[PDB]
Subunit: 345 residues, 3 copies
């Protein structure tokens, strides 16, 4: 609704934060640091940008105490914080732009709930959502339009599920979980026995999917259920869009899987891992904790020790960095085998 302006000083008092420069500077929105004019509050997160600070027009830059110590002399208007400058920036963001809901509060009449399903306090089920037999929908839970909550599936308190998500049977979603539109949770794992005449016999997958607390699942991401055990995404992990997660995959706590990456069956990913965009990881292997996998990686063996890895096959960062450099240098190496065929003897 708004088109609000506030004074630098007003913003500071709001943010409960120290400031230097004109208290009366007028600020009408937020903007990233390179683009920002005198109308905008902005931030610098960590040194990545730097060059963009002394030239910036920003009428206010949100800064940390160390960065203020580092940039003290520059003639800018600062808001000095001890929290993440990006996280203080978010507070400003939320001043100018407020979230918006669908405008269908509580349980819409068109929402179908099976008699055996248990509905908790303060829940919101949107038009045309379907809750199946013996499902548990938690307290303060949001279920979006045309979403499905399958048989025996449970959705822990404060979870938010966007429009057209499919939560198959026997899936348990933890607390404070966010699922973007299109996500499929609990699809059949891709398991066959090929007969001698080359015909593929389906193996009925009767496992579960466990998605733990504070996990996020992206748009149109598909997580398959295990054959008999469980596919698991552990507490705090964040999964981007269009991601494959095959039967009996386990993802650790506080891990990140970027868009369009895929992980084959019975692979375990450790805690605090990053899987880069469009990466691929085979079945029946492990990734150790604190591993970062670059974008477009093909990982063919377990990665046993922490560090950065890239390429396909995946090799440690230094080894692949060298490999690329040497491949670019083949023309210059043939030139050296050339000069050598200058031999008279």
């Amino acid at each position: 609704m708004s088109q609000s302006t506030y004074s630098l000083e007003q913003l500071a008092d709001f943010l409960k934060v120290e400031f230097q420069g004109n208290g009366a500077t007028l600020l009408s929105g937020v903007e990233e640091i390179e683009e920002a004019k005198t109308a905008h509050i902005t931030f610098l997160d960590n040194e990545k940008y730097a060059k963009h600070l002394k030239s910036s027009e920003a009428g206010a830059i949100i800064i940390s105490r160390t960065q203020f110590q580092k940039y003290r002399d520059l003639n800018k208007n600062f808001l000095i914080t001890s929290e993440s400058p990006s996280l203080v920036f978010q507070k400003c963001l939320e001043l100018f732009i407020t979230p918006v809901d669908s405008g269908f509060p509580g349980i819409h009449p068109t929402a179908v709930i099976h008699p055996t399903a248990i509905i908790e306090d303060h829940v919101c089920i949107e038009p045309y959502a379907v809750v199946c037999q013996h499902a548990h929908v938690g307290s303060a839970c949001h279920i979006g339009s045309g979403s499905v909550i399958g048989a025996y599936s449970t959705v822990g308190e404060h979870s938010y599920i966007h429009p057209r998500v499919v939560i198959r049977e026997r899936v348990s979603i933890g607390k404070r979980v966010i699922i973007q539109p299109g996500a499929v949770i609990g699809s059949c794992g891709f398991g066959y026995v090929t007969s001698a005449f080359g015909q593929h016999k389906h193996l009925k997958h009767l496992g579960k999917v466990i998605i733990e607390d504070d996990v996020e699942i992206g748009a149109n991401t598909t997580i398959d259920r295990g054959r008999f055990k469980h596919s698991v995404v552990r507490e705090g992990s964040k999964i981007d869009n269009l991601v494959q997660i095959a039967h009996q995959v386990e993802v650790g706590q506080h891990s990140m899987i970027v868009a369009q990456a895929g992980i084959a069956g019975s692979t375990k990913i450790g805690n605090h891992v990053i899987i880069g965009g469009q990466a691929g990881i085979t079945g029946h292997i492990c990734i150790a904790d604190h591993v970062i996998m670059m974008a477009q990686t093909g990982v063919t063996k377990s990665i046993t020790s922490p560090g950065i890895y890239g390429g396909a096959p995946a090799r440690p960062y230094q080894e692949i960095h060298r490999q690329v450099a040497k491949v670019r240098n083949l023309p210059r190496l043939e030139e050296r085998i050339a000069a050598l065929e200058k031999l008279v003897q």
Copy 2:
């Protein structure tokens, strides 16, 4: 059986196109030029050398004025146009297979429409679709069965939204846009802050997504919203299936993204660009106008000049072509040290 027969001349008059050949020739279907028979209507590509034309045994051949000039002397039945042969072929095709909707005209009773939302005239909203608060659906739109138009979002006139599409809140769709089944427009960016030794906190994404006119978005493709700025697909760009558009990516006009490709956050892609299938582009870069990236390209840095690119990391095409070759020639280069090490006399 064929629902229809026409004479060359009858069809010429239907198409509003000149003809050259035998006006009485009978025509009862369409086929591609290398498979067409006497009863068939076909078109001349734009490629396809003279040999394709000559040995074609087809009742009629849709051709352009320029091409005709070059092939005046050939005894074929020609349907000569100043438009694109294919576009004209299209109309011919539509005489043998007629397009079919779902059979639910106008606004279905089961559609749910928030009182605060404004639905223009002549709109088709199919069964079980939801239109949220302060949404605006323009005149002559189609909202597919079960699709969702989010809070405050706008759809321009003559847009076709197929079934089970999610348009999230604050999304702007222009005129004549087509969105395939299952697409997701305005999901949240993948943007987090890291605290407590690598725990990831959610950052509310409150920017919009802007889709300009004549843009097409393929099936199950996902287009995230910016953090505060906007994700933008410009005029006339066409996006395939299973594509990822990351937070606040800007795509130029008349650019093409092929299936399964992905652009990471905050990247600019200029006009007349083509991103081949299953490609990846990192965040915070630029692709100049008129760039073509081959399938499975992995782009790591900006591209500032036009032309074809491939490989991962992406290099100009000339480059990865020599590379593949020198790599392939590795044994034959090692064989040359199996000989240039025998000469080690004294």
Copy 3:
């Protein structure tokens, strides 16, 4: 969930046992962490090391494999069938499938008067069956799914929730389709003005899914401009897969998650396409060809065998290539020091 003894299990399975047939067992579990109460099996090799020291109450094992471990004092169940299959027979003794609790045709189903629905068929809340569709007997139509105009579903097929089937698609007998899939979206074909502009062409071809095909979650299959796209019988397709327009997938082929096949390409019978592999348009893949994950096929393949890499090359050749690439620092040695006989200046 109950308990059985080895002997009872052997007799149920019609399979021979070795070890003590009094051993009580009550569940299943992967080969490593199987206790005396768990049944397990061995059907690859990468977990074979876990056998010597595994504690399973029962190990289902092939006649061939049994030779290598029959000396160990583990309880074995020995079969000449698929160990995995025999294992499945056990699995189903402890866990049972669950339906949604909505039998037959839910009153919210919206069915067009001109559609035909056979006997003994389930249609779950808010499904939408459009004009001139036919749904065979013993079919399951999952919640919020769409069956488009003139589309048919063969008997005993299972459509999971939120599946979209567009116009003129024919699903064969006993097919499974996972949530989110999209069958019969528009092919990615445009007429490109010389000027750069891209013009839409309604795709009107039919799409055919033959009996026993399985299609994965969120997989998208496009229809041809006017000619047909076919998935021949028995083929299994995984999640997030792109099948572009006019593709023929031969019979009993496997396509793994996130693969993509480009336009009007023909895949043989008994073909395996690995995860994230890509195949260009207008080419051919011979019978019994196996692509590895992340393969990039750029040319037709005609000889059966294992293929990998990008561009695709036969197994032993890409192996050797990776090998010679890794070797490059070592090969530079034999060069650096080969050059350092400019000491032959004397």
